[PDB]
Design a protein around this nucleic acid. Structure first.
Ligand code: OH0
Ligand code: FE
Ligand code: ZN
Lengths: 455, 93, 120, 78, 107, 108, 94, 77, 97
DNA sequence: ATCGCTGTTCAATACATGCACAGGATGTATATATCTGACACGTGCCTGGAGACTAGGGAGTAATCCCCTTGGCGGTTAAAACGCGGGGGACAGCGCGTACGTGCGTTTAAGCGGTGCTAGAGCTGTCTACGACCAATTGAGCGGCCTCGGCACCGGGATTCTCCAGGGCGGCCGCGTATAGGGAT
DNA sequence: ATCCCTATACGCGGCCGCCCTGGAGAATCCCGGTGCCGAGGCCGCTCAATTGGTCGTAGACAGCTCTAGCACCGCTTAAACGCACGTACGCGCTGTCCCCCGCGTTTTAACCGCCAAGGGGATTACTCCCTAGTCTCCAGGCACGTGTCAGATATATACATCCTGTGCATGTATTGAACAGCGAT
């Protein structure tokens, strides 16, 4: 099972038990500009976005110069770009700036209001537009547009079409963005997502699932207050997660400066403005508040850069041992990337090598102890762009071999099983089909194909 | 013996509304039956009206009320007008 | 023989919705309707509010004679007659709907039940 | 004022009438039908009352108007 | 002494005397008012004249002089007031009004 | 004169023969009323009332009640076929309806 | 003030005959009174029409019996006619 | 003897009523309906005639029976 | 062999029989049926010719009206053919069953 | 840059319905001709309507009471209104095979014209019992009263249906299997 | 005479399946408890039903006529029957999309209790106007008889219509061409 150890890690090491003054705890974060396409497209900018030195960078006015029609992303032409769709919204209380008090009205507890809800897109558009101008020209309540699917380029054609005049790594997905290579359309992960919000809108702090780099463009006209934190302090969250009871993953919480102040976690406080762009570096746990009526276009990418992969796989391992749900299959992604990418760095070379070898070994052992003692070892074939199949009794990724049978269902739908849950099923496995889509010979051939180009 | 029917008067009314049109025998029987039906209806309704109000006579009031209760809307309006005019002319003479 | 129909849930990325306040228990659509049918088919109380019915009756009567006062038993009898008429009309409308192989009574069912009964 | 006969009341009437699933547009049609029926019966009752030279519609007037329509009613008078 | 039929006095064609006798001998009330027969005869004559005019128009629309039961049925069933007054009446040899449901008309 | 015996007693009835005779005479149904019409009509009315009341009492007993309310009368009328035919065009105020659900509306 | 006659006095006696330990409510009593009045009106009107058809001026037991045959449905008609015949025989005999 | 109302007769009646297609089982249904209607009307008429102490069923008796059932008939007195 | 498509002579017959007033049943079979029905109630009955004519006219009117209502009941259930269930529905909704 | 490969995006091509559109059978609206019997009129008279007076009770008008119909106020409590998520049902569309419509030949019996017999509907005269009418009387039923038990509300537990799981024992499917003996060398 | 070698009867073990079975949880029902108001029996009275006798006519009865209801025949032919064919239509199955239902939450107004005023229903009282009744006079309308013209039946005709086999036209189920992304050289 184990696929990782202290053999592959570019992750810079700092200790959470540190001391920091106000300057270090509140320093300006590395920022840059863009005066031509070559700037962002040049490796200097992309590396700056893949550079561990800066927790996050601001590409100020990037759209302001190239002039892509991000105003078409405006909820106005959004309604004139959609009448009916789903807009998931997190109901939350309109606190002023950073004063998310509690019932008693004089405390700042870590837990934050984060409740699910949804309706038609035009419903949220009406609500947000009406609450705009401050509801036709603290005390207030605010529905919070979140993760509004945009995986279709037809109804949003101007948007996605004009959203390609930028570099591939800052682009939705391309050979410089490993998300393209997963053969999937992870919602809110590899297909850009637009989320509208009103002043004070707050997405509780977090690290983007799997620790990718994030490309965020608030098309405005709203602004945004920010709280960025570098990846080192991540377990620091966990620390006060125990103190204030909240959790670091999948929970709800809006930190306050003093909250992590005993954590001595600095705060890269800054903002943006209509049309700007920003790169939230992989590993930056950020808590944002749209202080004005705005709409974000945000998604996640990882350049093949070495630091990205290592900063990311930590979350994958965490989730695997924390039974926590991930949103990107690193195993499968590592494969297609190691299969059709110009890997040209020894660091990432061995980095992938180790866990890929572990994948080979565990698939080997699985089929070995279960070939004839198993149950009809099948060869599905892995038709192109098969959705990554995830267990449900444990959720863990199932690669190559799998346990899928039609679990009743008047329409005969199919449910998936892994070795970990094959246990709860019965002795080893007794009842569920086995369907492995890659013969060990083919996967070994692909492994052999993996090489470090001299680029 | 000697029967009685409205055929003698139904032919006068006909001559007053369609001077050159005649009527067959079946049609005349239908007309006589229709007059009998409407007479029975109105007389019965007027009798019920008189009995309800603890009275023992049927007058123009009862007939007019029965016409209003049995006739549907515009027929009723025109019939009431014609009946009131007829009673006025009868009294004046 | 070739199954090739394996399936699973679709991935997505969303801001966490902590708490998860939800109401799981629900009756299937229709059972509570049958419960209401049974409950109202063993009772005798009127199913319409008295004050709204009185207001409607007076509004209608305003077009016949002005300053028309109503005995309480008069309005009660009018309500009884109207509700019995509507219940019978609904029984016939439901019969028409079942005839048309449906379960939902539509305006066409009411119109057919009225036409067949001779009420224009 | 016809809106006093509300959706829940029409639902209760239909339930007593044995209806299980009710279309959205049936409420307006029921309101129209009830208005027509009430207009007819009330016109007959007002005629009866006017005959007696009165100004209050008595239960007997409503009973007579209903029996005139072919809908005899028991328990509100003769 | 000079006779004068009450029909002439009221200006009617239907018999006021016969209507009065029928009202008296039909057991409708202990007494019959002077104007009751006149009103009832006037109403009967009005209804008869209206239906007769409609039937005559219908017959002339068929190129005929004599009115037959078919023309009476057409007059009664075409006009809404007369149709409602006689909605539960069957006229012998009257026939049915010409109608066909559009659903049945050829595609 | 002799001890006045009510006309109902001679007919062996409990409905008013004399009152029915009064109503027939004053209702202007006929010029004259025979001596036997009131007795026959009273007997028929008493029989009909006895039938309806027996059915209503059975319905009330089924309900575990001592008195008879209009609901019991409606049940008795709408159950018996002949009584339902006689009173088909009648509505009993505050009586309700006979429970029935179309077999297709029952849960599948 | 002024009196109002009703069939309640006799309806209760009939009820005591049928069920000797059961009562009746006021609303049910009004319903029964209305039923008696309605049936009386129906039978009397049919008998009057029968007498008018045959050029008679009196309503006899035969007119009432034929009206009962015409109005009451099936078995009820036979039972009512039998009862009425027995009642008239008892009345005339005594 | 009830079969004397032939299928063509019922088809003619339906045509006058407006029916375009007629099922094969409708003729028996129509025969039953007609038998019930005629039974009611004829029982009423025969009672009417028997009251008058007669043996002939007059046209007036049928008219009175129809008026009593609820079908007023014009053209026979 | 000029054959008319199904339903084209039916409409011609509908128009022909709606334009007319003649009694659609043969008089002799109807007379025999009436006599047979009557013989159950009273024996050795004699019928006036006018009485039989009135009975036939009333029966024709009743059946024509019932067929109109049954045709309406059939069209509602998306059908051009009338069937016994259509007639039964027309009779139930009519309060005569 | 380019000499190849590649996915998209456009236009061009073929095809079957909508619809003219001929003919041609078939049924229909029509227009003149002819004759029948039903309508429209006249004739006599005779039952019913009108003129005239009486005599009496029903209805109209007024005066008064007091019932009950309206107008209103407050709080409480269920019921209405609004919004949400989801599954169950309405509607469409396609396949099919079955039963009804059409037309033609065979033939059953209804329609029709006379014709005679008689059962009975219908009229007329008699008179007799029975129903109306009236006077006197009393006791049956109606208007109030009081009261006391049946029913109405209440609470609290006892089934009890709904409504999701989870299986357990019957089915078919289907993969595997053993093969071996008629064919071919 | 011997090798063969794959399709066939064999099996067995997975595979679905179709119900059964369990808890959990909203529903509704039933047992015990307390309390109120309405139904039931009593009492006083007054007016309606009974008794008892008389008057007049309505209907029951007998006698008698002439209508029309029934029954026959003998025939014409109009319609009902039966059959063969095919088509379109009723009915089942599948798919989707969406619109009602079950539920929770806010609000709102229905409802109950009580107060308060007065409008009009309900009654009694007095008076006269009008309706029933009676008698007589005579006019209209009913039954019966006559003729003549409107409508039905016939024919020959011209025309409206429906069914089927022609054509173009067009938007689309199906081709090549013109954009390109894309990469090793
Ligand atoms: C997986 C759901 C979140 C997607 C990542 C974006 C995010 O979490 N945001 O809060 C958006 C904030 C922004 O940068 O615009
Ligand atoms: Fe984040
Ligand atoms: Zn698992």
């Amino acid at each position: 099972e184990s696929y990782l150890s202290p053999a592959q890690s570019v992750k810079p090491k700092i200790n959470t038990e540190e001391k920091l003054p106000r300057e270090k705890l509140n320093p300006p974060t590395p920022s840059i500009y863009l005066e031509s396409k070559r700037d962002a497209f040049s490796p200097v900018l992309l590396q700056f976005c893949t550079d561990p030195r800066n927790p996050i960078t601001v590409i100020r006015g990037l759209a302001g110069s190239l002039r892509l029609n991000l105003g078409l992303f405006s909820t106005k032409t959004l309604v004139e770009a959609s009448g009916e769709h789903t807009v998931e919204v997190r109901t939350q209380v309109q606190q002023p700036s950073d004063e998310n008090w509690d019932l008693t009205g004089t405390r700042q507890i870590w837990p934050c209001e984060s409740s699910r809800s949804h309706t038609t897109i035009a419903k949220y558009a009406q609500y947000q537009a009406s609450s705009f101008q401050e509801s036709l020209q603290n005390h207030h309540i605010i529905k919070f547009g979140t993760n509004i699917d945009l995986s279709d380029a037809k109804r949003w054609k101007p948007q996605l079409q004009e959203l390609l005049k930028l570099p591939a790594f800052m682009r939705v997905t391309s050979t410089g963005n490993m998300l393209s290579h997963v053969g999937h359309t992870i919602l809110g992960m590899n297909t850009v997502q637009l989320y509208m919000k009103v002043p004070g809108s707050r997405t509780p702090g977090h690290q983007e699932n799997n620790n990718f780099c994030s490309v965020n463009i608030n098309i405005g006209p709203g602004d945004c207050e920010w709280f960025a934190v570098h990846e080192h302090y991540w377990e620091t969250i966990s620390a006060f997660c125990d103190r204030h009871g909240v959790d670091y993953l999948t929970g709800s919480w809006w930190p306050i400066l003093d909250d992590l102040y005993a954590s001595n976690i600095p705060v890269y406080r800054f903002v943006q403005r209509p049309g700007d762009l920003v790169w939230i570096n992989a590993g930056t746990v950020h808590w944002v508040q749209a202080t004005g009526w705005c709409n974000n276009i945000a998604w996640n990418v990882g350049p093949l850069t070495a630091y990205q992969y290592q900063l990311a796989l930590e979350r994958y391992e965490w989730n695997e041992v924390k039974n926590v749900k991930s949103i990107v299959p690193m195993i499968h992604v590592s494969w297609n990337v190691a299969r059709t990418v110009k890997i040209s760095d020894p660091d990432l070379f061995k980095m992938i090598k180790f866990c890929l070898l572990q994948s080979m070994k565990h698939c080997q052992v699985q089929r070995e102890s279960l070939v004839r003692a198993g149950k009809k070892i099948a060869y599905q074939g892995r038709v192109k762009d098969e959705p990554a199949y995830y267990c449900n009794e444990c959720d863990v990724e199932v690669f190559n071999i799998l346990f899928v049978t039609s679990e009743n269902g008047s329409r005969n739908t199919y449910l998936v099983h892994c070795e970990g849950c094959a246990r709860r099923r019965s002795a080893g496995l007794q009842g569920v089909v086995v369907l492995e889509q890659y013969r060990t010979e083919e996967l070994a051939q692909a492994y052999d194909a993996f090489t470090l180009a001299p680029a | 013996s000697r029967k009685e029917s409205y055929s003698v008067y139904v032919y006068k009314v006909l001559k007053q509304v369609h001077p050159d049109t005649g009527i067959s025998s079946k049609a005349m029987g239908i007309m006589n039956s229709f007059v009998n039906d409407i007479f029975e209806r109105i007389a019965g309704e007027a009798s019920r009206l008189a009995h309800y109000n603890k009275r023992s006579t049927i007058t123009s009031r009862e007939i007019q009320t029965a016409v209003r209760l049995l006739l549907p809307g515009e027929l009723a309006k025109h019939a009431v007008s014609e009946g009131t005019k007829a009673v006025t002319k009868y009294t004046s003479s | 023989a070739p199954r090739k129909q394996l399936a699973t849930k679709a991935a997505r990325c969303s801001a966490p919705a902590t708490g998860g306040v939800k109401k799981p228990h629900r009756y299937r659509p229709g059972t509570v309707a049958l419960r209401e049918i049974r409950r109202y088919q063993k009772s005798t109380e009127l199913l319409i509010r008295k004050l709204p019915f009185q207001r409607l009756v007076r509004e209608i009567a305003q077009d016949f004679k002005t300053d028309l006062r109503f005995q309480s038993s008069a309005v009660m009898a009018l309500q009884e007659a109207s509700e019995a008429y509507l219940v019978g009309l609904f029984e016939d409308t439901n019969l028409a709907a079942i005839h048309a192989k449906r379960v939902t009574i539509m305006p066409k069912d009411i119109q057919l039940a009225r036409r067949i009964r001779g009420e224009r | 004022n016809i809106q006093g006969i509300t959706k829940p009341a029409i639902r209760r009437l239909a339930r007593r009438g044995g209806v299980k699933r009710i279309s959205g547009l049936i409420y307006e049609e029921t309101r129209g039908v009830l208005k027509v029926f009430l207009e007819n019966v009330i016109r007959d009752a007002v005629t009866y009352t006017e005959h007696a030279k009165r100004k209050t519609v008595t239960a007997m007037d409503v009973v007579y108007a209903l029996k005139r329509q072919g809908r005899t009613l028991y328990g509100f008078g003769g | 002494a000079k006779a004068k039929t009450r029909s002439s006095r009221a200006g009617l064609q239907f018999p006021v005397g016969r209507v009065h006798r029928l009202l008296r001998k039909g057991n409708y009330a202990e007494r019959v008012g002077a104007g009751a027969p006149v009103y009832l005869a006037a109403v009967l004559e009005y209804l008869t004249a209206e239906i007769l005019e409609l039937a005559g128009n219908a017959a002339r629309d068929n190129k005929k002089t004599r009115i037959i039961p078919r023309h009476l049925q057409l007059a009664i069933r075409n006009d809404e007031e007369l149709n409602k007054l006689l909605g539960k009446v069957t006229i012998a040899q009257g026939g049915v009004l010409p109608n066909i449901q559009a659903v049945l008309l050829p595609k």
